[PDB]
Write a protein that binds this DNA or RNA. Structure first.
Ligand SMILES: [Mn+2]
Length: 250
RNA sequence: CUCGGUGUUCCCCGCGCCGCGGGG
C-alpha cells in the first residue's frame, strides 16, 4: 500500500533514460528481486496459480502436483513489479511499491547517486516521496496521460486503437486494485475515454541478454476517467522499466 | 512535475485451437 520514490532531477542539458539507469544499476551487485527476477527461480517474476483445473493440467504434464509458491510468488501473486525504474525527460528514479521492497531501494540508493552524478555532472536534485496508493471515484472527468505505454501485441495506428488502449488501461487498474485490496468504482462511473493515442510506433525489445527481433507497440496516451488515482499507477507491459506510467494532468 | 526508439518473438510462467495473456 505504501510507495517510496527516490527521484533525481536532471540538469537542463542532460538525458538519463530510465533504461539507462536500470542497465547501469545491473553492474552493482544488487539482489535479483531489484530487477524483478525471482531469486528462487532465477527467472522473471511470474503470476501464481490457484485453480483445481490448473492442478489437474499440471499433474497431466509433470506427473506431480504443483510445488508451493516461492516467497515472491506468495507475496506477489499477480506479478506486479515491486521495484520499477521510472522517469521522464527531466528526471529519473526508483519506485518501491510496498514495504517488502523498500530494502531493495535502500541497497540501490548510493549506486543510483553514483550513476546519476557521474552521467549528469553537477546540479542533480534529489527528492524522496512517500505515497499511499488509493483510488476513489469522482463525479466529473479527470484528465490523465500515460507516458510511453507499451503493448506487446495489439496496438494499431488506426482509429479503433483508442478503444483497445482504453481496455488495456481498465485491465491494468483492475489488476492493481485487486493486488493492493482497493475498491474500483463501477465502470459506468469510471467511464474511461481515451481521447488521443499519440504517435503509435514500434520499439525494439531489448533484454539483458541483448537486442531481439521482436518489436512492441509504444504510444503516448491522453485519457479521461472519473477517478482520482493517488500514488503511481501503471498500464501495459514492461512497467519495471518505467513504461506505461499514468500521470495526472495538473 | 506526459509525448527518445515507427513496428513482432530471445527467454520464463500460463491459457487456447501456430494464436493470445502475464513477467523481463
Ligand atoms: Mn463514456
Amino acid at each position: 500500500g505504501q510507495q517510496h520514490l527516490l527521484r533525481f532531477a536532471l540538469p537542463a542539458g542532460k538525458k538519463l533514460w530510465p533504461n539507462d539507469l536500470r542497465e547501469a544499476l545491473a553492474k552493482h551487485d544488487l539482489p535479483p528481486l531489484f530487477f524483478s527476477r525471482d531469486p528462487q527461480t532465477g527467472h522473471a517474476i511470474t503470476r501464481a496459480m490457484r485453480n483445481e483445473k490448473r492442478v489437474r493440467g499440471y499433474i497431466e504434464q509433470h506427473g506431480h502436483e504443483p510445488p508451493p509458491p516461492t516467497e515472491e510468488q506468495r507475496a506477489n501473486p499477480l506479478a506486479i513489479p515491486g521495484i520499477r525504474i521510472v522517469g521522464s525527460s527531466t528526471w529519473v528514479g526508483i519506485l518501491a511499491t510496498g514495504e517488502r521492497y523498500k530494502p531493495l531501494l535502500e541497497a540501490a540508493t548510493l549506486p543510483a547517486i553514483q550513476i546519476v552524478t557521474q552521467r549528469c555532472g553537477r546540479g542533480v536534485g534529489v527528492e524522496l516521496e512517500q505515497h499511499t496508493l488509493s483510488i476513489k471515484g469522482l463525479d466529473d472527468p479527470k484528465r490523465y496521460f500515460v507516458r510511453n505505454l507499451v503493448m506487446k501485441r495489439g496496438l494499431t495506428k488506426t482509429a479503433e486503437n483508442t478503444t483497445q488502449v482504453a481496455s488495456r488501461i481498465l485491465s491494468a487498474l483492475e489488476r492493481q486494485a485487486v493486488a493492493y485490496s482497493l475498491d474500483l468504482p463501477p465502470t459506468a462511473q469510471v467511464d474511461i475515454h481515451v481521447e488521443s493515442v499519440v504517435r503509435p510506433r514500434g520499439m525494439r525489445l531489448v533484454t539483458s541478454t541483448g537486442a531481439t527481433e521482436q518489436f512492441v507497440g509504444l504510444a503516448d496516451v491522453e485519457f479521461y476517467a472519473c477517478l482520482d488515482l493517488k500514488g503511481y499507477w501503471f498500464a501495459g507491459n514492461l512497467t519495471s522499466r518505467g513504461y506505461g506510467r499514468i500521470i495526472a494532468d495538473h
